[PDB]
Amino acid sequence: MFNLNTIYLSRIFIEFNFYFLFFLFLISSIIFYFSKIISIQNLNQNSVFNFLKLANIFGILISFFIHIISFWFYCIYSYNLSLNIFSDINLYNSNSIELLNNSLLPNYFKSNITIDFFGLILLTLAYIVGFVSILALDTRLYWKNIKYIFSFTIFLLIVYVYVTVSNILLFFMCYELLLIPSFLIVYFVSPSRRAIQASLYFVIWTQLGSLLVLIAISYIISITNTYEFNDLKYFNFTNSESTIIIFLIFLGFGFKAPIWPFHYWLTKTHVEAPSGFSIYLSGFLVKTALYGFYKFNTSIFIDIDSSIFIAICIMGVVDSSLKMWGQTDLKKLVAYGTIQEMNIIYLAFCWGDSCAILGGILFSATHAFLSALMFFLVDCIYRRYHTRSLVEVNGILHITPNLGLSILFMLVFFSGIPGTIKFISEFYIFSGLLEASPFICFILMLVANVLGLIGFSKSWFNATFGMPKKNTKYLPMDLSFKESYIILYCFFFLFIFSYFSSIFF
Amino acid sequence: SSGNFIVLFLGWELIGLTSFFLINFWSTRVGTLKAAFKAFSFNKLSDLFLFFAILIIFSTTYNLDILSFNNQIYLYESYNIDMFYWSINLIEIISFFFISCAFIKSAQFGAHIWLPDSMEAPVPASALIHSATLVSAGIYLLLRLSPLFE
Amino acid sequence: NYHYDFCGRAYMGNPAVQSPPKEFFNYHYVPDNYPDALSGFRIAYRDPFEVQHVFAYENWEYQYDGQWWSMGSLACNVLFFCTPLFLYLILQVEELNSEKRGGTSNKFYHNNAGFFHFQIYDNKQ
Amino acid sequence: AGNHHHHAGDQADRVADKIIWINIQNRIGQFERISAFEGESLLEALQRNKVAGIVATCEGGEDINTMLEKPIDPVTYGPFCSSCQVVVSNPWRNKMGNLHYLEERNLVRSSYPTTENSRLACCILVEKWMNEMIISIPQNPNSVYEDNM
Amino acid sequence: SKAYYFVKNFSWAEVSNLLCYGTKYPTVLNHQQKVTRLYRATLRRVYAHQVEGYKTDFKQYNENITDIGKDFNKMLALKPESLELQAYFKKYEDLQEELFDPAMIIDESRPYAASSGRYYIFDDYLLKFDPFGFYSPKLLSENRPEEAMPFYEDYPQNDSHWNLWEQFPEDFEDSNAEREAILKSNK
Amino acid sequence: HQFENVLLSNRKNLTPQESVQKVINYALLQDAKQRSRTLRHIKASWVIPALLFTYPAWYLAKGAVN
Amino acid sequence: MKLFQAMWTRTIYSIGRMVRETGLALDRYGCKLEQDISCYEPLSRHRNILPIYDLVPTFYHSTFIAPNSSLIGAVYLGQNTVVGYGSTLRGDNHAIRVGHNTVIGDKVAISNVATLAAGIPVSTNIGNHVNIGAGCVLQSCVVDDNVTVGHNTVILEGSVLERGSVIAPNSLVPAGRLIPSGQLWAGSPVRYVRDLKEEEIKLNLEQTEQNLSIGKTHKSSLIQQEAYDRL
Amino acid sequence: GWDRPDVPLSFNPLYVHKRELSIFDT
Amino acid sequence: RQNFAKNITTTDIPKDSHHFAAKRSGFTQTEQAPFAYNDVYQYPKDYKPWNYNYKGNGVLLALFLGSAFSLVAYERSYASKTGRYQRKVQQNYYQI
């Protein structure tokens, strides 16, 4: 019963949501530039900053709704396309349906849009995490950094082109564009003075991996003059070229997606970055690397043993889990948790295009939401209690019961209770790893889910419980409606996404 | 009253978490938190063992139903699992993990260290946990999966 | 057993009472930073010992070359250093079982001829 | 606030009782006497009083992780030149103590002759005990073309 | 006494010093303080083991306390720098070690005891605190200005900047009536 | 009905408290009107550049990347 | 629509500004070509009445405004209000309203704060027969009718003076405080002095009337001497 | 019988740090 | 800091002007001047700060209408899948 109307509606929605975002950004930027001689806030109720905040927030939100609709259309379209290809067995019949483009808006960068489930999951993560982070950064943007209210819109446009393109070069360029806005945010919006050095560490560490990926892309392009991302089927790389490409790709994308030993920059940046931008970084900016690694390694044929890469990922997991205990800083502890989860996700991609990719994608989504939740809780603690250190913070539950309850439920979700996409992703990865290498699976599970979990829980429980006798004149009140509903939405997603259609998982 | 291993694992984690809360009822005191954290660590170890056993069962038989597993385990009794450097009997390894988690939750010798410290809870909570609720989880596991351990 | 007098090489804070530190690393903010004013903008005076602990680890550093091996326990340090090698060797030994049996092996399988998961493959007129 | 002993209704203290006196031997062999305050660098005091013989090409160095912080941050870049050297008399030089490694590097790299008592004004932070401190200020070298401007 | 013997990683020597004398450094104590504290500790332990114990014998308790009292009277009479006094101190410290009981009863009136901190008592600062006007009336003028200070609004509890431009009723009349009237009068 | 300038009106008959209260209320109302007018002018300054320069900017971007 | 009207007003204002810019630039270029130095001359740019866009001072022609003074933004003067020499009514952030027969002394400065708490107007409002001495400072204060403020007096935000109150010179009214009617207050922090008498009230009324007459004479003399623009 | 004063704030005694919190005891 | 305007015109702020009264006679030579504004916030009676105080049926109606639309949409979808204009209810339904 599938008809061409659904196909064209899917394509039109995907194409036009990008232009909706772009036109919103363009209008907002034109207003901002041409309303004032100097593009800084006027400290009065009639400033354009209020309009810009409104436009950014409710462009992201409306584009997120349209993205939900377009993602559902894509799911139907992909399912029915697979059915059309698979169903017919007659040799004379073949599915050759050709679509003509609309005459209203042009194709951005003269590229035909191609959408995949992983790309749309990444785009949904971008939308939601960007919404949370923009909601967080309101107190940070003041009177000279208001120009960074558009950072998340720029991120959304970059990610949209990144996930809706079938061109290798455009793919790589979109991946590399993410550096400038993130560096500028960390440099100009971070309150702490150590953020200045943290930004440089972030730039250099990420750029080393960017150069590695650039070398790999140069190898692919120079050898294969193609750029369509599908002509690689008709060209085979020799053993030496293939091993060089996989090594470069893995190391370069692991610089971004933190792997052992390349997580020093991540720890520094998470500790010294804005509490609202740490959410976006951990939640989304480390998963574009995973998506790019998946695309490249599934496109290239590799005839090498992945034991070395699996060992690197497992070593990162073990290192982060063991170090969890020794952190009294909640933000650094959450950063180590992010490193652990990202290393597990990266390990999920070490078997080419096997079924491990499904667990990897689900784990990427759950880690995004869980890291957003954890960093937002740390943000609330730091903002109301003027410290994010375990020695200075104690007995949160008895003065701010809602915040303590949020911490406890965050710990329960992090533990991986059944009924959560966290548990589902752990089940996928461990079920595969048990047959792949059962002893390695046992070691990984033991370390991560006992030693790292206990180290993680020690600090959070100590902060939540106790007796806050110190500085009774300065104790805060409670979570606000904004914070409470953000926490509730994170919990709601982590719980209900387990009912998403199992066809794609 | 769990129909499959997933519900069993859910109930396992839930009793662990709620026992932790009952032990840590006196949240103001950090001395109580130490006993609560001891119980929490042992419960997490038991959860690890139970999760690994369930994963082994799922890998062997593509099913998590309790009745199906009980009526199928005899067929796979003869099987072995190739681990790091040893060929362990499948039934033996699965029963080893189950018995380990059961001992931890039933407070057998060695793993009983948390039970004396769990008495920090109020007497009603202590009675409920120590009579038939927390300390009988291992007994329930053995009774429910008896065909495996036979 | 751990006591400050007899620990020797397992360092820890001394039990003897000490005077508060006169100078210690402190929170510093970017120039012209916008203050955080949540819940009435009430700031309490920070405890010197607590602030010192907050910023001590970040600034801690090794005094002489090779101190890392000796600090703590040499055996545990060597085991931690060799952990990646142990993991790789365990993976290879496990993969021997996969090779001899016929199960999943550590390789980049290429069942799909570059066809991404549930990708839209279409042509235009 | 803080670091003061005033109660409600008290009169302010005189600046005369708070100024710290620095005695200098100029590059031309004459004697000078200037006033400084605690919390500001000797370089700032000397430039405020317009003492000759100091070029200060870098003008105090970096504005973050400065050498003036009592616990010097290890990520500090140190002084960016050696054009503010001053010779301090032994009674106060010993109290100042051993040199930072970056400061010593710059001092030894100085193109003009140096003394064991030499120190950088930007690296010196004024303290109460420095009252009546005697220093000498020979001429410092000129680094680049912009110094003449 | 803080009753923190089994917490804070005390060594056996430190715990023994805490039990025998209230301090962890008995050297700081003088002769009278040492003797009196040791006598009190010995009597407390003897009472714990031979009065509030298992099938306690009160006659034996009386005899034991009498002997201890005579010995401690002799100890107090003895000079501080005497090997006999040192032997007495060692004897009674050994007795304290012998009677040391893990999980010994700790009175609920002492710090670090079971039930010591079960409740958090709220201070008058928290009791007064009421930023909104439901319980404690809130002035429309947020604060009362003090002399020698400007009149500034108090910082709100919630400082979210997600605020729209000022909203006005639909069809709100906002013509500059004052200027219009003055211009009309001027002509 | 008809505009009345309370500040320039005669308030000698009323008590001083009533007089000051009327002046305060009149000032608040006039300030609200002025606030509305200035906000409207700011909104117009926002709208004009958007209408004038949105299409030229889209034209420039479209020509650049297509 | 009001928004469209505002947009049209802004557009025409910008066009006029651009026309002025090009005209003045052309005149300067013509001077350069003609070897004429007239454009170069530096002359005071001070404007007695300066209007912020949409905020134009309004005053009855009967008022005397000193040419040395400066009215800016939303300022509103009454029938015979007198503004002294050198006094500035900035009134740019909010409005400044003055009564029919008030007198503002020389060097008086009036400027209102950005914002205040709820229920407190952020504009300066002055009664009908107020007499403010030279050198006074006022900020977002309400003054009722028949109020005399001594010279060198500071009145801060949210301060309300009722009818007939008198403040001695060289005194400050703390922000957010009330000066009841018919009372004399003095001191740097104002302190109660006494209740005014009928003789003192009559003297103050005569003083303000004399000041109004002196303002009228000043206006006539300045118009005679061409120092006052015949508005 | 006796009218007891309200429960003492002393019941929870504020703890004042007198020793450095060593990073080796984190 | 906050720069919004307190005096809104959408509605009049609830207030009580009798709780605090300003002294206007009997002053001394050492007493400070009284305060001009003495109005306090007055909450509506029966307002409970510990819950949402929500008395509208909009959310419930929206959720119920969404559920009803979902039900009817599923009915139509099942009919379309079975290739019928409407569901063909069977005479007996068993457990499954």
Ligand SMILES: CCCCCCCCCCCCCCCCCC(=O)OC[C@H](COP(=O)([O-])OCC(O)COP(=O)([O-])OC[C@@H](COC(=O)CCCCCCCCCCCCCCCCC)OC(=O)CCCCCCCCCCCCCCCCC)OC(=O)CCCCCCCCCCCCCCCCC
């Ligand atoms: C303070 C919060 C702090 C949070 C931050 C901290 C977070 C971490 C710590 C957490 C712990 C601390 C916080 C807890 C203490 C809060 C204290 C407090 O605020 O007290 C006031 C608070 C509010 O009460 P109130 O202030 O007195 O009055 C509020 C108004 O009067 C009510 O006005 P009304 O009467 O008009 O009601 C409006 C509306 C309430 O409106 C909403 O909440 C909007 C919801 C929009 C959708 C969002 C996703 C919802 C996902 C499911 C969860 C539903 C919400 C219930 C809460 C979560 C679960 C506990 O009510 C409904 O109609 C309920 C129906 C909702 C169903 C919507 C389903 C959408 C689709 C979901 C996916 C598909 C499902 C398929 C199911 C198939 C059949 C099984 O106290 C409560 O009443 C608590 C209610 C708790 C939930 C139970 C009641 C609802 C049950 C709904 C149906 C499910 C039950 C079984 C149904 C079986 C048949 C299907």
Ligand SMILES: CCCCCCCCCCCCCCCCCC(=O)OC[C@H](COP(=O)([O-])OCC(O)COP(=O)([O-])OC[C@@H](COC(=O)CCCCCCCCCCCCCCCCC)OC(=O)CCCCCCCCCCCCCCCCC)OC(=O)CCCCCCCCCCCCCCCCC
């Ligand atoms: C390659 C062939 C393998 C197959 C053959 C069979 C296996 C042979 C393995 C070799 C065994 C004999 C050699 C070990 C000597 C001890 C280690 C050493 O030399 O470091 C310097 C040694 C250790 O210095 P340190 O660790 O800085 O001292 C810390 C302080 O004591 C302060 O300590 P604390 O109070 O703070 O407490 C911390 C304590 C306790 O720490 C803890 O509680 C945390 C856990 C620590 C690890 C405990 C072992 C866990 C299992 C390890 C499995 C490794 C698997 C990966 C490697 C596989 C290699 C095939 O940390 C220690 O364990 C330190 C003691 C020394 C390490 C003992 C554990 C590791 C030994 C190597 C095991 C290798 C097994 C291979 C087979 C595995 C199955 C296939 O320094 C001393 O000599 C001081 C005395 C230390 C106690 C010695 C006790 C007697 C040991 C035997 C003496 C006679 C040896 C004759 C050799 C003849 C030629 C071959």
Ligand SMILES: CCCCCCCCCCCCCCCCCC(=O)OC[C@H](COP(=O)([O-])OCC(O)COP(=O)([O-])OC[C@@H](COC(=O)CCCCCCCCCCCCCCCCC)OC(=O)CCCCCCCCCCCCCCCCC)OC(=O)CCCCCCCCCCCCCCCCC
């Ligand atoms: C282990 C972790 C556990 C964590 C959780 C622990 C437990 C936490 C408990 C505490 C927190 C949750 C429970 C309490 C939540 C608050 C409930 C409440 O009452 O708050 C009051 C709260 C505050 O009250 P307020 O300040 O007055 O604000 C009012 C609202 O702004 C707006 O109020 P309003 O009265 O203005 O109503 C507005 C309404 C307006 O409502 C209406 O308009 C309905 C009535 C008109 C129907 C149409 C008639 C058309 C013809 C005209 C007929 C004549 C006129 C009829 C109407 C007359 C007037 C009634 O508009 C809408 O709702 C728009 C929705 C539209 C899209 C969805 C529905 C449509 C679907 C498609 C329908 C297709 C078929 C229909 C086609 C129609 C033709 C095209 O208001 C609300 O309830 C608003 C809803 C959202 C509240 C927050 C929900 C949070 C949910 C958190 C869930 C967390 C789940 C975690 C699960 C974890 C599992 C592991």
Ligand SMILES: CCCCCCCCCCCCCCCCCC(=O)OC[C@H](COP(=O)([O-])OCC[N+](C)(C)C)OC(=O)CCCCCCCCCCCCCCCCC
């Ligand atoms: C060649 C064509 C070029 C087209 C250029 C487009 C020009 C856009 C100019 C924007 C001006 C914004 C201010 C308008 C005046 C607001 C007056 C006011 O507040 O009174 C309340 C009134 C009405 O309020 P109300 O109380 O009736 O609330 C209902 C609101 N509506 C009518 C929308 C359902 O005005 C508004 O509320 C309008 C709000 C406008 C700002 C919206 C911000 C969200 C993001 C969209 C911004 C525009 C970008 C383009 C669209 C998105 C991308 C497709």
Ligand SMILES: CCCCCCCCCCCCCCCCCC(=O)OC[C@H](COP(=O)([O-])OCC[N+](C)(C)C)OC(=O)CCCCCCCCCCCCCCCCC
């Ligand atoms: C981890 C190091 C620290 C972090 C920085 C990362 C730097 C290293 C990044 C990975 C580089 C690739 C290493 C694995 C190569 C595997 C293939 C191989 O060489 O085997 C012999 C290969 C494979 O041979 P084969 O035996 O498999 O098959 C071919 C055999 N013949 C030819 C005989 C028929 O043989 C070769 O052809 C030699 C190729 C050597 C290439 C080495 C230089 C690569 C230069 C490009 C990358 C430079 C990145 C620098 C980044 C900045 C560093 C500061």
Ligand SMILES: CCCCCCCCCCCCCCCCCC(=O)OC[C@H](COP(=O)([O-])OCC[N+](C)(C)C)OC(=O)CCCCCCCCCCCCCCCCC
């Ligand atoms: C607490 C319990 C702990 C349990 C033990 C945990 C692990 C202990 C260490 C296991 C070591 C296993 C070594 C053999 C596997 C070699 C894999 C390989 O091919 O690598 C070649 C590698 C290179 O591999 P490669 O990847 O280049 O191979 C080419 C790719 N394939 C194979 C796919 C074609 O070469 C090496 O560098 C190996 C160096 C070995 C150095 C000596 C190691 C001695 C270890 C002795 C351990 C003690 C005895 C056993 C104890 C247990 C008995 C039950």
Ligand SMILES: Nc1ncnc2c1ncn2[C@@H]1O[C@H](COP(=O)(O)OP(=O)(O)O)[C@@H](O)[C@H]1O
């Ligand atoms: N930061 C700390 N580092 C090392 N030991 C500590 C520390 N804090 C407490 N201790 C231990 O606590 C005990 C003292 O407890 P405390 O609460 O300070 O009461 P008091 O000092 O009056 O005896 C000592 O054994 C001491 O060694």
Ligand code: FES
């Ligand atoms: S100013 Fe350059 S080193 Fe001092």
